[PDB]
Amino acid sequence: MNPPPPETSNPNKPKRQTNQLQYLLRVVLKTLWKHQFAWPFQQPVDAVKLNLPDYYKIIKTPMDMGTIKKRLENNYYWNAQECIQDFNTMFTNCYIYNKPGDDIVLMAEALEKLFLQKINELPT
Ligand SMILES: Cc1ccc([C@H](C)Nc2ccc3c(c2)N(C2CC2)[C@H](C)C(=O)N3C)cc1
Numbered sequence: 001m002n003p004p005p006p007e008t009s010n011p012n013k014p015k016r017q018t019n020q021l022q023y024l025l026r027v028v029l030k031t032l033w034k035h036q037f038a039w040p041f042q043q044p045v046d047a048v049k050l051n052l053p054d055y056y057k058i059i060k061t062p063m064d065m066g067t068i069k070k071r072l073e074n075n076y077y078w079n080a081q082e083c084i085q086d087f088n089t090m091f092t093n094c095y096i097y098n099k100p101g102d103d104i105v106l107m108a109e110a111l112e113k114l115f116l117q118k119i120n121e122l123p124t
Contacts (some may be wrong), residue, residue: 017075020122025069
């Protein structure tokens, strides 16, 4: 019941390694990765393990930090804005599928606060 995960490698994609993208991996993602609440978001939602066959009926553009990490490590992105959009997709998916006050939403909200603080200032 799980869809194939989002692509992390694509040679036809134009790739770039900007200072901002290096920082998004070295600083932003690796800070969030060690957060006490990161673990649900370190890999795609496994709807089979969670017994949530409804998850991928609702969420049609899944995203997670494990995919984001592999993309950054594959220099998959052209600019930091594309990577930030992936983070935002991951958070928005969680708020769409769940309801305010749910434990998973509190974890996402905490990660997002940290995320917004870390990207408030990026390199030039
Ligand atoms: C507080 C708590 C409760 C359950 C789990 C289970 C083990 N793993 C898990 C990983 C990712 C997600 C979810 C569960 N949930 C909901 C099920 C709670 C939905 C699908 C969601 O949107 N995401 C991003 C972890 C943390």
